[PDB]
Amino acid sequence: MKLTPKELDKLMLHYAGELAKKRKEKGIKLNYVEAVALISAHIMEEARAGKKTAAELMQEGRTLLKPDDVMDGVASMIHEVGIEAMFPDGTKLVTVHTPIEANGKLVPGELFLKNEDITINEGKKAVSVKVKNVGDRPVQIGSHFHFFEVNRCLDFDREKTFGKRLDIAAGTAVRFEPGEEKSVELIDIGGNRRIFGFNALVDRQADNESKKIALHRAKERGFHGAKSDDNYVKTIKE
Amino acid sequence: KTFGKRLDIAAGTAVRFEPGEEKSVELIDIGGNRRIFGFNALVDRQADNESKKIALHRAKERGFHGAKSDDNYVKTIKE
Amino acid sequence: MKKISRKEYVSMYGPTTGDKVRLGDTDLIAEVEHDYTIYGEELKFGGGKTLREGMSQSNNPSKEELDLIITNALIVDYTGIYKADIGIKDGKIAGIGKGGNKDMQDGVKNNLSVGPATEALAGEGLIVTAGGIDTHIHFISPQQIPTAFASGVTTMIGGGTGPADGTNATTITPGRRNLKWMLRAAEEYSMNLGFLAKGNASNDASLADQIEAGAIGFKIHEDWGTTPSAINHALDVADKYDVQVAIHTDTLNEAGCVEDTMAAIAGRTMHTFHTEGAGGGHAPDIIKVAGEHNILPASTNPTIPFTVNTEAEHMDMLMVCHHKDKSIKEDVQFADSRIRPQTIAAEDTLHDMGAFSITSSDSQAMGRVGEVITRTWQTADKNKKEFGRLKEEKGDNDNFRIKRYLSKYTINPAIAHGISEYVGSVEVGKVADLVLWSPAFFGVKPNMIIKGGFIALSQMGDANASIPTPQPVYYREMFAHHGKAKYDANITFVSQAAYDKGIKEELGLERQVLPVKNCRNVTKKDMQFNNTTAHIEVNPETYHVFVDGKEVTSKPANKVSLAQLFSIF
Ligand code: NI
Numbered sequence: 001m002k003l004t005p006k007e008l009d010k011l012m013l014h015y016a017g018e019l020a021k022k023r024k025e026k027g028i029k030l031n032y033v034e035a036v037a038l039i040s041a042h043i044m045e046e047a048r049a050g051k052k053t054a055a056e057l058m059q060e061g062r063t064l065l066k067p068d069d070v071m072d073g074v075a076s077m078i079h080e081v082g083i084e085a086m087f088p089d090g091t092k093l094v095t096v097h098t099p100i101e102a103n104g105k106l107v108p109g110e111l112f113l114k115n116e117d118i119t120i121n122e123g124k125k126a127v128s129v130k131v132k133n134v135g136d137r138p139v140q141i142g143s144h145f146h147f148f149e150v151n152r153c154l155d156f157d158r159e160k161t162f163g164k165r166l167d168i169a170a171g172t173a174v175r176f177e178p179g180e181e182k183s184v185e186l187i188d189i190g191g192n193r194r195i196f197g198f199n200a201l202v203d204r205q206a207d208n209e210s211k212k213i214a215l216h217r218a219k220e221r222g223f224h225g226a227k228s229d230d231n232y233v234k235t236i237k238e
Numbered sequence: 239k240t241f242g243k244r245l246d247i248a249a250g251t252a253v254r255f256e257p258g259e260e261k262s263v264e265l266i267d268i269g270g271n272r273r274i275f276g277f278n279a280l281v282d283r284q285a286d287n288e289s290k291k292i293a294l295h296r297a298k299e300r301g302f303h304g305a306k307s308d309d310n311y312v313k314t315i316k317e
Numbered sequence: 318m319k320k321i322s323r324k325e326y327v328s329m330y331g332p333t334t335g336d337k338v339r340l341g342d343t344d345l346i347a348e349v350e351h352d353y354t355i356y357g358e359e360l361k362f363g364g365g366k367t368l369r370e371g372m373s374q375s376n377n378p379s380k381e382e383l384d385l386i387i388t389n390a391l392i393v394d395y396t397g398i399y400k401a402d403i404g405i406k407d408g409k410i411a412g413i414g415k416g417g418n419k420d421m422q423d424g425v426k427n428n429l430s431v432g433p434a435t436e437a438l439a440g441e442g443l444i445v446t447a448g449g450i451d452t453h454i455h456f457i458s459p460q461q462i463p464t465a466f467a468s469g470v471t472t473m474i475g476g477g478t479g480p481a482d483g484t485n486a487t488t489i490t491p492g493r494r495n496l497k498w499m500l501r502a503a504e505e506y507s508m509n510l511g512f513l514a515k516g517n518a519s520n521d522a523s524l525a526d527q528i529e530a531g532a533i534g535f536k537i538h539e540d541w542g543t544t545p546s547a548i549n550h551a552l553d554v555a556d557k558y559d560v561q562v563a564i565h566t567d568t569l570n571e572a573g574c575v576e577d578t579m580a581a582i583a584g585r586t587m588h589t590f591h592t593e594g595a596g597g598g599h600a601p602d603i604i605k606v607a608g609e610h611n612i613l614p615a616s617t618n619p620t621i622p623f624t625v626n627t628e629a630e631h632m633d634m635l636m637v638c639h640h641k642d643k644s645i646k647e648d649v650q651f652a653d654s655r656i657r658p659q660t661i662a663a664e665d666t667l668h669d670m671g672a673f674s675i676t677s678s679d680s681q682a683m684g685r686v687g688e689v690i691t692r693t694w695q696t697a698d699k700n701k702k703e704f705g706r707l708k709e710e711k712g713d714n715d716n717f718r719i720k721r722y723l724s725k726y727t728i729n730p731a732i733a734h735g736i737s738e739y740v741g742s743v744e745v746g747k748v749a750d751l752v753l754w755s756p757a758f759f760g761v762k763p764n765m766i767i768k769g770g771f772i773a774l775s776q777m778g779d780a781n782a783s784i785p786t787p788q789p790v791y792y793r794e795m796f797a798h799h800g801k802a803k804y805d806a807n808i809t810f811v812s813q814a815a816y817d818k819g820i821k822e823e824l825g826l827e828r829q830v831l832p833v834k835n836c837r838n839v840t841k842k843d844m845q846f847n848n849t850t851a852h853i854e855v856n857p858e859t860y861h862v863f864v865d866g867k868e869v870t871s872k873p874a875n876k877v878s879l880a881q882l883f884s885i886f
């Protein structure tokens with residue numbers, strides 16, 4: 001019966017679920033491991049039966065255990081239980097979000113933040129810019145992307161955003177639906193202000209002179225808002 | 239008019255131009271193999287009538303006063 | 318736990334936290350910011366003192382045992398001004414803190430353990446700083462070395478082949494053969510060395526070969542033709558080999574103006590020598606460059622500080638040089654379009670503002686390789702006397718300003734030439750190039766120069782006397798200056814490329830040979846306490862200097878400190 005190593009993985013999980021249930025049967029507050037295995041073993045069988053759809057099990061899994069069935073802490077712990085099973089249409093990923101509820105105090109590793117607000121990008125005075133997505137597709141820019149070089153679709157005053165980035169929490173971004181128009185905040189880039197990569201519009205020291213070159217480049221490359229060519233005076237290298 | 243030429247003066251000397259000043263300078267043609275490399279990067283090759291075309295075109299775009307004009311340039315396969 | 322007065326304590330271990338020292342005969346007052354010792358356990362060497370068997374000196378040292386301890390030294394460095402013991406092992410600064418014998422004293426890291434193998438150097442009452450690093454040297458004459466050395470400088474970077482006109486005019490050692498001669502010659506001296514090659518070439522092949530040959534970087538100079546071509550080509554190859562580039566601007570503006578030179582540089586890193594202008598460069602607005610981000614501004618020794626005599630002096634040097642005449646107008650014009658007393662005085666202040674970052678010499682060619690340190694402090698003294706203390710200054714001292722200038726000839730030149738990791742500041746892990754200063758003579762005449770963890774030069778008296786103090790007392794070569802010891806104590810710098818190609822074994826170089834690195838990712842913002850950028854203009858008519866709108870200038874001086882007071886000549 002050529003059992004794959006994946007199959008053995010599941011066969012083991014199942015008896016971890018079986019144990020899990022048999023314990024609840026005897027009436028015993030399940031724990032992190034037991035709760036998860038149980039939820040997992042369950043979904044597994046249901047997919048075997050070929051009845052419940054993937055979409056349905058996502059939920060039905062949230063009714064396998066009630067707050068009084070588990071130990072305090074378990075709820076705050078099992079944020080979610082992902083699991084794969086073979087449906088008549090093949091294996092599919094079922095994610096049972098928050099299966100049980102926090103009917104108790106104890107919360108492992110809980111955080112005790114201190115109400116107050118972190119002030120991001122200290123002293124980097126932002127600037128607002130009118131931006132509109134003239135294209136027919138979406139466009140989302142990251143927090144540290146040289147704004148001046150985003151999709152050539154976003155129309156706006158390129159000239160004004162040279163050497164700047166979206167003044168937002170590191171790692172996040174701003175979305176622009178086709179047609180949408182908004183005003184974004186953008187501070188200047190820190191460090192050595194050495195802009196290399198992106199759209200290849202700068203690739204050097206970001207200064208007022210490099211700027212001239214950047215606009216000229218964007219201009220010829222079709223980046224909406226890229227000012228204009230009021231007669232360029234090409235340097236010895238660019 | 240001064241392509242491939244240099245100030246016809248004693249080797250090592252120079253001619254000064256005060257801001258505003260205007261003068262007429264003498265200039266003979268460069269000797270040797272007339273291989274112009276360096277300077278402002280306007281030539282960097284054999285100095286001939288063809289390289290000239292390229293030189294003026296280059297100076298033109300680089301803003302060198304007097305650099306004739308772009309009466310529609312016909313870019314070569316390498317320049 | 319009986320206690321003792323401050324006056325006493327300080328005559329045994331030197332100044333402690335909160336105390337202040339006057340630097341030489343200047344008005345610059347430094348304050349001990351911190352002290353790592355433990356009052357009662359401080360280290361002392363002597364007849365019945367603390368550094369002895371079983372006591373301060375361990376009989377069970379750690380297997381890191383030091384080779385040398387500088388006791389109770391006051392460390393003046395861009396990293397701070399404090400009190401602490403310095404531990405030295407294997408030519409490197411192994412530790413900065415308490416140190417002594419853990420067997421008999423609390424708090425003593427094992428990288429500071431004192432055992433029978435460690436030597437003792439008293440530092441109480443003295444100030445310890447890193448060796449100086451002059452990066453604008455003309456290898457005109459080998460006699461410069463022992464001069465720069467006696468002045469607290471342990472590292473010289475520049476170019477040349479001896480008293481040859483090319484060298485007298487520029488800091489360049491051209492071609493791999495001449496690079497060979499110099500590297501092999503360097504074996505002889507007591508001073509880390511690095512050489513710059515001829516960047517005045519639009520030939521890429523010739524450009525990289527000099528690096529592959531041993532050069533730590535290029536030098537573009539006027540006399541060789543500092544054109545936008547040469548400039549552009551050099552820089553590119555410089556980017557590949559992660560090596561530095563120095564430059565002397567096109568004074569005659571023949572190829573273009575400072576605007577063009579910059580466009581040439583294309584925003585890449587650059588070490589600008591004598592950015593002011595007197596030492597040479599675009600007439601008359603070259604000094605403006607020292608405000609750009611991608612620039613590493615450096616000033617040349619001569620016009621520093623600005624004295625009532627500096628203007629007259631220079632006109633002479635510029636005339637004695639270049640072959641200028643008083644009766645010829647074009648000759649008087651060039652002289653006036655280069656020796657701007659305006660941009661000169663504007664300098665002293667630019668340094669004070671953090672606008673300028675490095676202080677060079679320009680030895681044997683409009684520079685005094687023996688007065689870089691002395692003059693760096695004189696200038697600081699003036700600016701305080703004329704502008705007062707600093708806004709950034711915290712407390713009743715000049716600490717901040719102090720670090721500002723120190724960095725100018727230590728950590729800043731070190732970074733500008735990729736050798737910051739090994740030298741350039743009193744920090745753990747770096748080569749032990751330290752110079753002990755006796756507070757009174759600070760900035761002028763140092764007590765002793767320790768090269769590579771061992772004493773190489775020190776004040777020495779009658780070699781026949783019963784002690785080292787009696788006269789005559791001049792600077793005598795010490796042990797790290799002789800035999801095979803010099804080789805262990807010195808370093809000749811090279812590029813990664815050469816280092817990798819085995820340039821050391823290649824040339825039979827018996828000296829420690831390291832390669833320079835991180836030269837292409839540095840900007841004006843990498844210059845310690847001298848990271849101020851700014852859009853500075855320069856009046857074409859009055860040669861007046863303007864920064865961020867306003868204008869800067871300093872007043873000349875009739876007298877300077879660290880001068881006639883200390884030398885018989
Ligand atoms: Ni120079």
Ligand code: NI
Nearest residue numbers: 487488679682
């Ligand atoms: Ni020089």
